[PDB]
Enzyme design. Sequence first.
Site, PDB file in Angstrom:
ATOM      1  N   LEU A   1      10.024 -27.536 -13.070  1.00 53.07           N
ATOM      2  CA  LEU A   1       8.975 -27.823 -12.098  1.00 53.07           C
ATOM      3  C   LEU A   1       7.609 -27.325 -12.552  1.00 53.07           C
ATOM      4  O   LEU A   1       6.591 -27.881 -12.146  1.00 53.07           O
ATOM      5  CB  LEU A   1       9.322 -27.280 -10.709  1.00 53.07           C
TER       6      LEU A   1
ATOM      7  N   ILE B   1      15.734 -21.870 -14.998  1.00 42.97           N
ATOM      8  CA  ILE B   1      15.896 -23.242 -15.490  1.00 42.97           C
ATOM      9  C   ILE B   1      15.126 -24.276 -14.646  1.00 42.97           C
ATOM     10  O   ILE B   1      14.509 -25.193 -15.196  1.00 42.97           O
ATOM     11  CB  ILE B   1      17.400 -23.615 -15.608  1.00 42.97           C
ATOM     12  N   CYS B   2      15.152 -24.118 -13.323  1.00 39.94           N
ATOM     13  CA  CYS B   2      14.433 -25.021 -12.417  1.00 39.94           C
ATOM     14  C   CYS B   2      12.946 -24.707 -12.414  1.00 39.94           C
ATOM     15  O   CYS B   2      12.116 -25.590 -12.192  1.00 39.94           O
ATOM     16  CB  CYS B   2      14.974 -24.904 -10.995  1.00 39.94           C
ATOM     17  N   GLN B   3      12.619 -23.438 -12.639  1.00 40.79           N
ATOM     18  CA  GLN B   3      11.236 -22.997 -12.707  1.00 40.79           C
ATOM     19  C   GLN B   3      10.565 -23.686 -13.887  1.00 40.79           C
ATOM     20  O   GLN B   3       9.487 -24.254 -13.746  1.00 40.79           O
ATOM     21  CB  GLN B   3      11.159 -21.476 -12.884  1.00 40.79           C
TER      22      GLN B   3
END
Lengths: 153, 153
Positions: free
Chosen positions: B50, B45-47
């Site tokens: 960003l 999800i953060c990948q």
Amino acid sequence: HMLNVGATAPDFTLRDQNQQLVTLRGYRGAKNVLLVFFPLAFTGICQGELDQLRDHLPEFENDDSAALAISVGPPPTHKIWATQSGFTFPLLSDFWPHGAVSQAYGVFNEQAGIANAGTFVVDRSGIIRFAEMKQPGEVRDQRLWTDALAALT
Amino acid sequence: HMLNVGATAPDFTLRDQNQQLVTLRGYRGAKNVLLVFFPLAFTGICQGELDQLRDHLPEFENDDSAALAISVGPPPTHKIWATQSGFTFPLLSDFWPHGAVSQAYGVFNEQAGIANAGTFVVDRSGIIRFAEMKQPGEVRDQRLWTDALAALT
């Protein structure tokens, strides 16, 4: 200051790198447990210590013993690090509350917010039988860990 | 609650992935700042988030704007992750105290001990001009951020 030999090992339930829950008391009556606290993943010193543990793993993870590495890092961090480093032993996350377990064992660095390189051996009764704090400019002796574990069988 | 538009962006001083200090007030009177709070490094999800930032970096990091990603992970974690993902923007560590900066912006998740997916745009005066928190389950449309920065020139 570290919990001394003879003290009851504080209980804890922490997530391993694969999100499974690992409880110290789950080993009571079955295996002696080696607790390896370490400051941070992806740092040269911790790498060396856990690499040495990986290389001699059968002496720590066997029918009589279990080995658990513990740090303030969360599971995704430990998962990636374990995969690249080839660590198959459990890396537990003392992430939230931050360093709660490390503080209970008296191996938490309040200034930096990381666990000091402390190692414990918990016997089948949940009593700490070995306690070693890493000294400046040096790696912990793991032959000393295997011998301590071997002595409890 | 999350800090909303009109509020003063709380000042902070944090280490980036290369251990260099990054302060928010250093950008006042010079550039608009995109603050991207994300939960954890090495998570899908953060990948995704960003990566979207990375793929359109020139629109956020230029003469008129800068982009700062922030999470509770320490620098070595962000360093490795930035190297693997090709992130050249600063990933700041809200590590110790744990989530302090995130709590000041009202984007800290007290249950899991991580920052919620919150994005802010701070103008040259230090005032929040854009504030949006990811609808967990829905993905952030980053063209909304570019338009927010576009209006500040």
